[PDB]
Write an enzyme that holds these catalytic residues in place. Structure first.
Site, PDB file in Angstrom:
ATOM      1  N   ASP A 181       0.821  -1.217   0.000  1.00  0.00           N
ATOM      2  CA  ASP A 181       0.000   0.000   0.000  1.00  0.00           C
ATOM      3  C   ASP A 181       0.858   1.272   0.000  1.00  0.00           C
ATOM      4  OD1 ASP A 181      -2.527  -1.289  -0.098  1.00  0.00           O
ATOM      5  OD2 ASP A 181      -3.212  -0.506   1.839  1.00  0.00           O
ATOM      6  N   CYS A 215      -2.169   0.411 -13.401  1.00  0.00           N
ATOM      7  CA  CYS A 215      -2.159   0.462 -11.986  1.00  0.00           C
ATOM      8  C   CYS A 215      -3.305   1.454 -11.616  1.00  0.00           C
ATOM      9  CB  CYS A 215      -0.780   0.896 -11.592  1.00  0.00           C
ATOM     10  SG  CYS A 215      -0.092   2.266 -12.417  1.00  0.00           S
ATOM     11  N   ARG A 221       3.664   2.624 -10.998  1.00  0.00           N
ATOM     12  CA  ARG A 221       3.848   1.176 -10.986  1.00  0.00           C
ATOM     13  C   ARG A 221       3.905   0.653 -12.419  1.00  0.00           C
ATOM     14  NH1 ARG A 221      -0.509  -1.127  -6.456  1.00  0.00           N
ATOM     15  NH2 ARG A 221      -0.074   0.669  -5.107  1.00  0.00           N
ATOM     16  N   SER A 222       3.094   1.185 -13.315  1.00  0.00           N
ATOM     17  CA  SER A 222       3.104   0.865 -14.757  1.00  0.00           C
ATOM     18  C   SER A 222       4.451   1.233 -15.423  1.00  0.00           C
ATOM     19  CB  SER A 222       2.022   1.632 -15.514  1.00  0.00           C
ATOM     20  OG  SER A 222       0.777   1.507 -14.940  1.00  0.00           O
ATOM     21  N   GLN A 262       6.829   7.751 -10.576  1.00  0.00           N
ATOM     22  CA  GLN A 262       6.278   8.726  -9.663  1.00  0.00           C
ATOM     23  C   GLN A 262       6.950   9.410  -8.396  1.00  0.00           C
ATOM     24  OE1 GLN A 262       1.568   9.069  -8.672  1.00  0.00           O
ATOM     25  NE2 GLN A 262       3.254   9.522  -7.270  1.00  0.00           N
TER      26      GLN A 262
END
Ligand SMILES: CC(=O)N[C@@H](Cc1ccc(O)cc1)C(=O)NN
Length: 282
Positions: A181, A215, A221-222, A262
């Site tokens: 998370d 994602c 995450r992608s 990110q």
């Protein structure tokens, strides 16, 4: 300057955010006029996340062709990918219309429906065999065929029916489940094996249309998934494996999709995913 050495000095100095902001400062900036039109307010999960007009995946229809999906085309690497956001309650029929149009084999998911107590994307695939989903707006039907549940991912077999041609195709759901998370995965070991597992399937091969990866935002995450595959592919390929610049790969990708990668932890973790994968290609 090799990717083992760099790191090292990046650690030795600890200037990940400092490396990370420069890429943010050197990145492509292009218009996103389609995204921003008012009738598309509901096809964006995030107001600050938008596909560039010059690389936007367009949906085959003359009324409204808009989806928050872009084509990352890697010349050198002879590899192509579509990055998209987690679908919304109003985009579900659009995501599968994309899968169809584009002729993809695979669908990759780096996220759970529920994280931190809230919704990351819509429930967009059938959970039970006799419980099929029909996407009315877009005339397709999807059926759960089989399920391979394991520790870090689950692989699902699905049947996609273009209810208008009555043609059918088989799509593969590659769903990574254990990403945490907060943070990044504690060890690149599991992300990598799942990356080999997706290649294993034949889904990132030229013999099909590009793979769809998402994602929540379609950039974080992608971005690691594609930055790492491409860097691995590039290392196998060149004379000088050593030659691979990870920052340089990232900015090339960044020309086709805004903000891929990110946080500064993802950059490094992306670095350990490349570094560690080389250790099999060989
Ligand atoms: C030394 C360091 O800065 N580590 C990061 C965390 C990290 C761990 C594994 C990853 O794969 C990527 C990032 C950190 O402490 N950030 N604050």
């Amino acid at each position: 300057m090799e990717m083992e050495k760099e790191f090292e000095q990046i650690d030795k100095s600890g200037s990940w955010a400092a490396i990370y902001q420069d890429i943010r400062h050197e990145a492509s900036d292009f218009p996103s006029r389609v995204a921003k039109l008012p009738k598309n307010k509901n096809r964006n999960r995030y107001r600050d996340v938008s596909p560039f007009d010059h690389s936007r995946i367009k949906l085959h229809q003359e009324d409204n062709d808009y989806i928050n999906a872009s084509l990352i085309k890697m010349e050198e690497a002879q590899r192509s990918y579509i990055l998209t956001q987690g679908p919304l309650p109003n985009t579900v029929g659009h995501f599968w219309e994309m899968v169809w149009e584009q002729k993809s084999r695979g669908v990759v998911m780096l996220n759970r429906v529920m994280e931190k107590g809230s919704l990351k994307c819509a429930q967009y695939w059938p959970q039970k065999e006799e419980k099929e989903m029909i996407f009315e707006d877009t005339n397709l039907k999807l059926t759960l065929i089989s399920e391979d549940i394991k520790s870090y991912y689950t692989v699902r077999q699905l049947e996609l029916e273009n209810l208008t041609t009555q043609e059918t195709r088989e799509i593969l759901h590659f769903h990574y489940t254990t990403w945490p998370d907060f943070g990044v995965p504690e060890s690149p070991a599991s992300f990598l094996n799942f990356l080999f597992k997706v290649r294993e399937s034949g889904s990132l091969s030229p013999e099909h249309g590009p793979v769809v990866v998402h994602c929540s935002a379609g950039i974080g995450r992608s971005g690691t998934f594609c930055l790492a595959d491409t860097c691995l592919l590039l290392m196998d390929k060149r004379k000088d494996p050593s030659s691979v610049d990870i920052k340089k790969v990232l900015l090339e990708m960044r020309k086709f999709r805004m903000g891929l990668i990110q946080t500064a932890d993802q950059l490094r973790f992306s670095y350990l995913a490349v570094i560690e994968g080389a250790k099999f290609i060989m």
